[PDB]
Design a protein around this nucleic acid. Structure first.
Lengths: 97, 105, 96, 85, 92, 98, 83, 95
DNA sequence: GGATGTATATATCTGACACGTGCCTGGAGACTAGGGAGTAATCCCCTTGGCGGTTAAAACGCGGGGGACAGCGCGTACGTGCGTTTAAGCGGTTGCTAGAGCTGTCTACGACCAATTGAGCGGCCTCGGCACCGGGATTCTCC
DNA sequence: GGAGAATCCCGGTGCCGAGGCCGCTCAATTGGTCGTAGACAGCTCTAGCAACCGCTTAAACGCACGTACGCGCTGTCCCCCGCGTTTTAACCGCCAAGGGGATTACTCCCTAGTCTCCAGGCACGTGTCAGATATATACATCC
C-alpha cells in the first residue's frame, strides 16, 4: 500500500498546528486536574468557567514556549529527538530548576 | 464646557486619565499636563498596534481583526515584541517557524 | 437591582481604528485584548513616574515624569515618536 | 463535600503532548518525555493555583474568579491579555 | 541625618550571636535587604487593597502579602511571628 | 503618663513608629491601620534574625568573629528558601559557592 | 577627549579568570570577542538608564543610586551601595 | 617539571574561594566613560558608581559562564564555544 | 621518591569597630469629627450535578527503518612555561566645579459647588465568516 | 524523468449569531473660586571629581612545543513512527436546584488632623583589637 516516509507526517502536523490557534488539550480532563490540584489548598471550592479557560491558555502557552527551548537544546546536542535531559537543561538555564 | 481631549486634539479621554491618576495612589498631586501627555502616548501606541493588526487582517482576506492578527502584528515587529515580551495573548497562536535542521534534504 | 456601569476603552479604540483602517472591524475578544493592553501600559508608565517622583523627593507627577518614564519603558523609535506625540499634544493643549 | 479526585494527571494524554510539541516545532519525541511534561505542568499549575486561592481567600469568597488567575499570573511575570483587566 | 536600620540590626545580632561583630559593608547590605523586603511587602499590600476596593491597609493585607511573597516555611514562621506581635500589642 | 514606645508594647526591636511613618509617606493607600506597622515590623525583625543567625554560623565556621559580605552570601546561597527569596539579588563582594 | 579601543582593555587573562570563577576548564579562542560583545551590550543597556535618571534630576554627575535604580528596573537588584 | 594540561585549572578553586574583582579598574573605568560618551557629553561619575557597575557586570559574566558550561557539557564537550554562549543567551530570553 | 603548591602557626600593628556626649527632630499622648467598613437582608444568576446520545479521539498492537550511540583514528588548537614589555596602582599634588543647603516668592494644585453632556446599558437589525461540498491542483513515494 | 495518490486549496452554497447602529438616563466631567503650600530662582560654599606626575613591579603579551580533545566516519540495533482496528469518554444539549455574590440601607468606630511634650537616634569625638601580611614549616597533592 501507500506509506509516507517517517518525517513527512511530522512536518505536515507541525505546519497544521502552527497555523491554528485552538486549545490542544481536552477541556474536561484539564478541568478535573485543576480541581484536584486545588482541593489541596482549600476544600469545597468553586470555579468560574473563565477561570479554568484562563488557566488552560496560560498552561498551553507555557508548555509550547518550553518545547521551543527544548528543541533548541536537542539541536545543540546534534540530535533531532528531544529527551528529558533537554527539558531539564532548558528549565535549568531559564532559572526554574 | 469644552472637553480637554478636543483641546489637546485627541481621541482618548483626558478626564478619565486624570481621575485614574488621582485615584491610583501615585503621588500627592497630579500636574495639569501629565494627563494630556499620557493620553497622547496611549493613543499613539494604540494606533501603532492597530495599523499593523489591520494590515495582517487584510493579508488574510478578512475584514475583522481577531486575536490571531494581533499576535502576528506584535510578534512580527521588533519593538512591539520587546515591549510585550512577557505577555501572553489568548487565542493568538505562534508564528509559523520550522528549524532548517528538520527540513528534508 | 441595577447593573453597575463597567468602564473600558472600547469607544476610543474604535475611534482610533476608524481613523487608521476605515473599513476594518474588530471582534469582542480582540477588543478585550486591546483593553488589557491599554490598562497594562497605563499602569507601567504610572508606576515608573511615581517611582521617579519619589526618588527626587517631589510630590507632583508632571509631564516631565511622564516623558522620562516613556523614555525608560519604550524601546527604540517607539520612544521617539511617543515623546514627540506627547509634546505636540501638550503644546496644543496649552496654546488654547 | 463532593468527592476526592485522584489520578487526573494521566488525563493529559500522549496525543495532546504530541500536539503541543508539534506547535512547538518539534519533529521527533522520546518515549520518556510524557512523564517529564506531566510533572512540569503539575508544578506550574500548583504554583499558579496556590496564588489564585490566596487571592480568593483574602477576598473572603468561595468561588475562584478569572481576575484571581490574572493577578496570580501577573505576579509571576506571565501577564495574560484577554480575560479582563 | 541619613536614617538607617543599623542600630536595630545590631540589637538583633546581639540576641542571636552575643559575641560577633559586623563590618560596614555587611551592615549596608543588611540595610539594603530590609529596605527591599519592606518595599516588596508594602507594594503587594497596596495592590491587594486596590483589588478589593479598599482604602485602608490593615494587618490582614500584610498577612496576605507575606503569604504571597515568602516561600514555604519562611511564610509560616513569619505569619506566626506577626500574629504573636499584634496579639501582644493589642492586649497592652 | 510616661511615654512607652509602640515597639516595646509589642516586644520588638525594630521601630514601629518609623515603619508607620514610612507607610504613611509612601503612597500605598489613603489610610493605614493601627496593627499593620506592628505586623510588618515583626516580620522584618524575624527575617533579619533568620539571616543573621546563618551568617554568624558561617562566620564561626571560618574562624572569624565578624560578619563580612562573604558570610552573608554563603548563608543565603546555602539556604534553599533564602536563596529562593533572594534569587534575583546580587550581593557585592560576595563571591560564589565553591 | 574622545576614547577609542577601550573594549580591548578587557584583556584575555581577565576573561579567563571570570570563566574560572564560573567553573570552566577549557576555553575556545573565539570566546574573547564574543564575551567583549556581550559585556558591551550589557553595559550600554545599563548606562542608558543611569544617564536617563541623571538627566531627569538636572544633574551632571552620575551617582551610585542612579546605577542602583537602573539595575533594579531591569531585574538585577544589587545590595551594598544603597547608602 | 610540567603539570598535565588540566591540573592547573587549581585556578577554579582559587577563584571560587576569593571575592575580589577580576577585571582591572582603570581599563573598566575608561570603557565605561567611553560608552557613556554616546549618551551625553561631559559627564562625571562618582567612584561609587563605577564600582557598582563593575560589581554588576562581573556578576553577570560569571552567571553567564555557568550556563555556558552547562551547555558545553550538554553537547558532550569540555571546551566552551561561542555557540554555547549563544544558546545560553537565547534560552534565557536575551536573543 | 622528588617536586611543588597549600594550609598552619607566630609576630606585627593599624585602621576600622565599638563606646560616650548634646540635642533636636520625630514619635507618643489626648482630643475631635467624619467617612470607611462591617452587619443584615434580599434576590437572581450561574455554578454544580445528572442523563442521553453520538462519534471522534485515544489506546493498542505490529512491522520496519532511521537515528542515537559507541568505537576508532587523526589532526588541530589549546594549554603550559618562559622571557620580555607595558601600564596599572599608589601616593601625592592642584584646581575648580557642581551638588547641597538656605531664603524668599508666587504660581499651580486641591477642595467645593453647580451645571450638563458624554458614555454605558438595553434593544434592533444584517451581513462577514464558517461548515460543507466539489473540483482542481499539489507534493510525495515508487519505478 | 514519469505516474498514481493522499492531501491541500479555491470557489460556491446556505446560514447564523455576533458586530454595528440608536435611544435614554445619570454619573462623571467641566467651569469658577479661593486658599496655601510645593516648587523655583538666587546665592554661598565646600567636598569631591578631574587632571598631572613619578616610580615600582606585577601583570599582560608573545613564542614555541606537545598533547589531549573535538570532529568525522562507520557500523549496529533499538525504539520511535505509520497505520489499521477497537474501545472509550469528551462534548453537546437539555433540565433541576440552590448557594453565593452582588446590591442596598444603616450604624458606629477607627483613623486622620491638630497640638503639645519629651526622649531616642544620630552626628562627633575617643580608645582598642581582629584580621591581614609577613616569615617559617610540615604536609598533601602530583608526576
Amino acid at each position: 500500500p501507500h506509506r509516507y516516509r517517517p518525517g513527512t507526517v511530522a512536518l505536515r502536523e507541525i505546519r497544521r498546528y502552527q497555523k491554528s490557534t485552538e486549545l490542544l488539550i481536552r477541556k474536561l480532563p484539564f478541568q478535573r486536574l485543576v480541581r484536584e490540584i486545588a482541593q489541596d489548598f482549600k476544600t469545597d471550592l468553586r470555579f468560574q468557567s473563565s477561570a479554568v479557560m484562563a488557566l488552560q491558555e496560560a498552561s498551553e502557552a507555557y508548555l509550547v514556549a518550553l518545547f521551543e527551548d527544548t528543541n533548541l537544546a536537542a539541536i545543540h546536542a546534534k540530535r533531532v529527538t528531544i529527551m528529558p535531559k533537554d527539558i531539564q537543561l532548558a528549565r535549568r538555564i531559564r532559572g526554574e530548576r | 464646557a469644552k472637553t480637554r481631549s478636543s483641546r489637546a486634539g485627541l481621541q482618548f479621554p483626558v478626564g478619565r486619565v486624570h481621575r485614574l491618576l488621582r485615584k491610583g495612589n501615585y503621588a500627592e498631586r497630579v500636574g495639569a499636563g501629565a494627563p494630556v501627555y499620557l493620553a497622547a502616548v496611549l493613543e499613539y501606541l494604540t494606533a501603532e498596534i492597530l495599523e499593523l493588526a489591520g494590515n495582517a487582517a487584510r493579508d488574510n482576506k478578512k475584514t475583522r481583526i481577531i486575536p490571531r492578527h494581533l499576535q502576528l502584528a506584535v510578534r512580527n515587529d521588533e519593538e512591539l515584541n520587546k515591549l510585550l515580551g512577557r505577555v501572553t495573548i489568548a487565542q493568538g497562536g505562534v508564528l509559523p517557524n520550522i528549524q532548517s535542521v528538520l527540513l528534508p534534504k | 437591582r441595577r447593573k453597575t456601569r463597567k468602564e473600558s476603552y472600547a469607544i476610543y479604540v474604535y475611534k482610533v481604528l476608524k481613523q487608521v483602517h476605515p473599513d476594518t472591524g474588530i471582534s469582542c475578544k480582540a477588543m478585550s485584548i486591546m483593553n488589557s493592553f491599554v490598562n497594562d501600559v497605563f499602569e507601567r508608565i504610572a508606576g515608573e513616574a511615581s517611582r521617579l517622583a519619589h526618588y527626587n523627593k517631589r510630590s507632583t507627577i508632571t509631564s516631565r515624569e511622564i516623558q522620562t518614564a516613556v523614555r525608560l519603558l519604550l524601546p527604540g523609535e517607539l520612544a521617539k515618536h511617543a515623546v514627540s506625540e506627547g509634546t505636540k499634544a501638550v503644546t496644543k493643549y496649552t496654546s488654547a | 463535600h463532593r468527592k476526592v479526585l485522584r489520578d487526573n494527571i494521566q488525563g493529559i494524554t500522549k496525543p495532546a503532548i504530541r500536539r503541543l510539541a508539534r506547535r512547538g516545532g518539534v519533529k521527533r519525541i522520546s518515549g520518556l518525555i510524557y512523564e517529564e511534561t506531566r510533572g512540569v505542568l503539575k508544578v506550574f499549575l500548583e504554583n499558579v493555583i496556590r496564588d489564585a486561592v490566596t487571592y480568593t481567600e483574602h477576598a473572603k469568597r468561595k468561588t475562584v474568579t478569572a481576575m484571581d488567575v490574572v493577578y496570580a499570573l501577573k505576579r509571576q511575570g506571565r501577564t495574560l491579555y484577554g480575560f479582563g483587566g
